[PDB]
Amino acid sequence: EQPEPRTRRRAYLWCKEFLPGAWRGLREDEFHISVIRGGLSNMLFQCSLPDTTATLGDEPRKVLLRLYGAEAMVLESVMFAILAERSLGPKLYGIFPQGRLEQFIPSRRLDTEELSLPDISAEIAEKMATFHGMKMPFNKEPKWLFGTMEKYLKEVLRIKFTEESRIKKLHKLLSYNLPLELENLRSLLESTPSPVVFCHNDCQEGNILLLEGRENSEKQKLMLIDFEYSSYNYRGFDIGNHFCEWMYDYSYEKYPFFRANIRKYPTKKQQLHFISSYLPAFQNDFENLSTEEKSIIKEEMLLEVNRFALASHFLWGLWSIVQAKISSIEFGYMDYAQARFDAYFHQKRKLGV
Ligand SMILES: CN(C)c1cc[n+](Cc2ccc(-c3ccccc3)cc2)cc1
């Protein structure tokens, strides 16, 4: 797909002015661009040199253009630049009011089923442990989790839908008495020790790259991307959120445009495999501990992450209701909220909370 003529010309100018080497001498009529993701906001394009133009230094031959569309920008930009310097995320080539030029990384995204592959899960754990070791210049108070759940709750209780099915669905969702349940959840998570770390906060399969050519490689075949929700937070949340994502498939091509399967949440066996990879990646002298000491740490982690997984359901369930009101993307947001709340109570029953 080709962009609007206007966009082609703005993109040409950004590449010409922000990129070194052959980009500086490029003629408009040899500039290549294609739409990766359309929409009104956060549009993605691939921009590239012609095959007939040689690289003059180490300028990239292909780049990703991200267009914003329609304080948060300061923090997002700084975070992205820092992660790029530290080689955790894609390189940053250009920043401007309308968007960014980022490294283009040949890859495809993982699907839901691939999250359960032992080899894949172990590397996700290592990548997340590496991400959790980042020191960042942002607020280190863990206010994000309940701060955000409270804000969303307030928004949800003020929604006035007009469409009949959404009115009905919301009435069912609010019938549980969410303020009390949120404060019971707050109570439980307060008594659940969990270190505050820099978390991704959105570790779903759609945010993990399987790097081109590395498919048959043992380690180092993945990259975590899309950091826009990252913040200091309880470690249990990041891991528990990721576990939740085993159950949801966003590639269903018919309404409600997702599939939920409770039976696909990781077994305790599968969780153990994941945390056994996470721990030595997070605390490097971990392997030097006695089998007994490692076992205690692992057991306590299992309880931590499964309690925090409840906050993933509660948060994204509320989030989804808000989206049903304010979004414009075709997706069964109310049905999705119901699925998250269904899982909240199912898991709560199983915990004995
Ligand atoms: C805002 N944030 C970090 C979230 C929000 C929602 N979720 C779960 C979720 C993921 C994808 C979707 C979705 C929405 C529209 C189209 C395809 C997938 C919905 C909910 C995870 C993290």
From Swiss-Prot:
Changing S175D: Mimics phosphorylation; promoting localization to lipid droplets. One of its GO terms (molecular function) is protein tyrosine kinase activity. Changing P90S: In NEDMIMS; a functional model in yeast shows reduced choline kinase activity. Keywords: Acetylation, ATP-binding, Cytoplasm, Disease variant, Epilepsy, Intellectual disability, Kinase, Lipid biosynthesis, Lipid droplet, Lipid metabolism, Nucleotide-binding, Phospholipid biosynthesis, Phospholipid metabolism, Phosphoprotein, Transferase, Tyrosine-protein kinase. GO terms for biological process: CDP-choline pathway; cellular response to glucose starvation; lipid droplet disassembly; lipid metabolic process; lipid transport; phosphatidylcholine biosynthetic process; phosphatidylethanolamine biosynthetic process. Homodimerization or heterodimerization is required for the choline and ethanolamine kinase activities. It comes from the Eukaryota. The modification Phosphoserine is found at S175. Plays a key role in phospholipid biosynthesis by catalyzing the phosphorylation of free choline to phosphocholine, the first step in phosphatidylcholine biosynthesis. Also phosphorylates ethanolamine, thereby contributing to phosphatidylethanolamine biosynthesis. Has higher activity with choline. May contribute to tumor cell growth. This is Choline kinase alpha. The gene is CHKA. The chain holds residues 81 to 457 of 457 of the full protein.
